[PDB]
Every structure is written in C-alpha cells, then in structure tokens.
C-alpha cells in the first residue's frame, strides 16, 4: 500500500568520495577533514594478500605511493597510518564539504544506506540491512570496493560500514570505519565462507506493525515461550531490549508487543494461504522498528 524502502539522501556522502590508487590497485576512499579512509588492502596486489604481513607491507610504502583523486583535483598525501583494517591517509587539504559525522558500529538487523561508487564516482544508493551472518548480497557492490554505508539523523552522517571484498559466492564483506571486520572475515586470500543466515525477528514484527497501520489485520504471551518457538524456524532471538524498541509501534497501534509475537507464532506454521501482507507474500525483515515509525 505504498510502504516503501527509503534511502538516505546521499549528497553529504557524495561530497566525500575520492579515488585512491596505490600501484595497480584503485578503489574508493572517504575524505573527511584532512584524512582519507580506505581499505588497507589498497597497498596490496592480489598476490600480496596470499600471506600478507600488513605492517611489513606498509613499511615499504611512502606517501608518494598513494594517489588521491577528488574529482578533477589530486590531493597530496602527507601522512599514512593503519588503524585495524582501514588505512588513514592524511592529506594537505581539509575537505570543505565535510559534514557533521561520526563513526558507529552497528548490529545485525540494523539498516543503512550504501552509496555504491566506481573508482570515486557515485553510481547508486541502496537501502541495506546488516544480515545476521554479517554479509551483503547483490551485484551492486561488485567493482565498488571501499564504498561506505551510513545513516543520516538531523543532517549528521553516522558512517557504519566500508566495503572491502566480494567472496566467491557473490556476497560482500566489510568493516566499520575503525577497521574491524563485521563477522569472521579477513583481508587475505583464503577460504572464509559466510555462516548460515537467519531471519531478523524484531524486524519482522516491525513489518507486521506496519502491516496493521495500513489496514492488514488478520492475525505465547511470554517472551520466553515465543523465543522457544522462534528458535525453531531459523529466526533470531527476541531480547527484552527488542520488546522495548517495539514500544513506540505498540503504543501507536495499541497492540501489545507480546500480542504481536503471538500473531507471528502461527504465521510460520500454517503458510502463505495465498494471501498478501503489504503487497508481499513473504515476511519482510529488512525494516527496523525505527524505519517503520520513520515512515508511519
């Protein structure tokens, strides 16, 4: 009924996207104040990442080995340092388009917009969720290494994600902006298959609340008894903090969260019944409770 996924307006991030080249490797960087952030494997050929000692590899690089292009302007690199798996290139020019920003680390199930870029050039914006197995699926990040994910709240940009690599299955892995990987992945040429992906329970309940707000109303009182049922259909556990988050939606629809959980209980058992929920026949799990109140 017109309930749509929203991407954040990407202009504040577009103004920060640059191209970083080191040898034969070119990828996207993020220019904030006088620092450019990018994956540390920018210093590596693919053969370098067979058995990389990144501290030793970085010792062999100088500032002049880093070529930073911001549109038509080359930015001179005047310092470099590793923070976890992110490289920080100090440049001689502070970005005059730097927005208010902060670096945050998010949790599976939380959503964010990704600005896919090709070699510093913005291509498209996608609203994504952090899957429980910490991967992002889709071809839009192919050839978009170093693109970032973000939320915007009152024109403050919370950067939460930087893309590092596509796995042989086609799913993607990355870090936060402090350079710590989401999930058990490594910037090394080695097998590292993603774990089993599960369904984000708290988001499905938010979507059911969105389904009640737009008039779809055909629908385990205790939290613990519901979790006993949810853990059997490959759904994530519902914490007491989750029920707190669903409070706002619960007050608006007047529907108790545990009552909504009771409704989710039997949807997983019976089936589709050939009917639709918000123009969908499957349960949707990529809208957070915040995303729903944001729209409704």
């Amino acid at each position, epitope marked *: 009924s017109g309930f749509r996924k929203m991407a954040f307006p990407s202009g504040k991030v577009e103004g920060c996207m640059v191209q970083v080249t080191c040898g*034969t*490797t070119t*990828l996207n960087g993020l220019w904030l104040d006088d620092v450019v952030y990018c*994956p540390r*494997h920018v210093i590596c*050929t*693919s*053969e370098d*990442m*067979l058995n990389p000692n990144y501290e030793d590899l970085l010792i062999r690089k100088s500032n002049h080995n880093f070529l930073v292009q911001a549109g038509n302007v080359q930015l001179r690199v005047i310092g470099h340092s590793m923070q976890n798996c992110v490289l920080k290139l100090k440049v001689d020019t502070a970005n005059p388009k730097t927005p208010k920003y902060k670096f945050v680390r998010i949790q599976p199930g939380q959503t964010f917009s990704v600005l896919a870029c090709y070699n510093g050039s913005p291509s498209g914006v996608y609203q994504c969720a952090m899957r429980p197995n910490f991967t992002i699926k889709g*071809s839009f990040l*192919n*050839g978009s*290494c170093g693109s970032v994910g973000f939320n915007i709240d009152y024109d403050c940009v919370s950067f939460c994600y930087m893309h*590092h*690599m*596509e*796995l*042989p*299955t*086609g799913v993607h892995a990355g870090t936060d902006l402090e350079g710590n990987f989401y999930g058990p992945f490594v*910037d*090394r*040429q*080695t*097998a*590292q*298959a993603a774990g089993t992906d599960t369904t984000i329970t708290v988001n499905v309940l938010a979507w059911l609340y969105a389904a009640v707000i737009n008039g779809d109303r055909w629908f385990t009182t205790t939290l613990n008894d519901f979790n006993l049922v949810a853990m059997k259909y490959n759904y994530e556990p519902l914490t007491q903090d989750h029920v707190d988050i669903l409070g706002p939606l619960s007050a608006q629809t007047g529907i108790a969260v545990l009552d909504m959980c009771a409704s989710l209980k039997e949807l997983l058992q019976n089936g589709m019944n050939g009917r639709t929920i918000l123009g969908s026949a499957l349960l949707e799990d990529e809208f957070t409770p915040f995303d729903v109140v944001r729209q409704c």
Partner: nanobody
Amino acid sequence: VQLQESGGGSVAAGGSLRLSCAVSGVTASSVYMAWFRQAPGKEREGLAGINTVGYTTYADSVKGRFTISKDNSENTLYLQMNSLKPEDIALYYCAATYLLRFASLSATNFPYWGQGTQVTVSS
C-alpha cells in the same frame, strides 16, 4: 591452489576448441574462476568468469561464441570456444581467486594462474 590448462591447438577460422583447466590443491567449488588470454604483446584480457553459485560474466569480445562451465565433480573448468577468428590467437590462461575487489574479469582480482595453453587460428 594449482591450475593446469589443456585443450589448446591449431584450427582454421570458424573452427572450435574446448579448453580444460584442472584444479588441484583446493576444491573448484571454493574459488571464483575465470578464463583469460594473453594475445601477443597484449595485457591479459578477462574473457569469462563464474562464481561459486553459477553466476557468469562474459567479455563483449567473446559473447555468443565462448561458454564457460564448471564440473565440480571433476574439479575442472571448461571454455567452449566456437567461431574462432585470427583475433583470438593467444595463450589462454585459467585463473582463480578467493576474493574480488575489482570488476570481475579484471586480472587484478586473481593471484592464482595456470601456465597457459596455446590457441592458433589460421585465416
């Protein structure tokens, strides 16, 4: 990772060849795999690639003529080469990778390479 190409040879224009790439040391189901060629004095050109769930990418230069396929039971990668032309003369290389950072068919993605098999086409 160990890659060995076979199946090259000499044909006349319009002819056909089937290249094979035998994978050793790892399972072919665990790596992104691709076929490249090195024409005389040219940089390596990515022709066809396949990820481990079957998604294929082809260069425009070989679309409609070359087909990449994979037999995990034999741990072998194949390139069916139809409608060959003198422009196709090169050593043809098998390649594999655990990690992509660039457009799929870019040689910069690949740390593992075979030694190449020769394809010649008379006009």
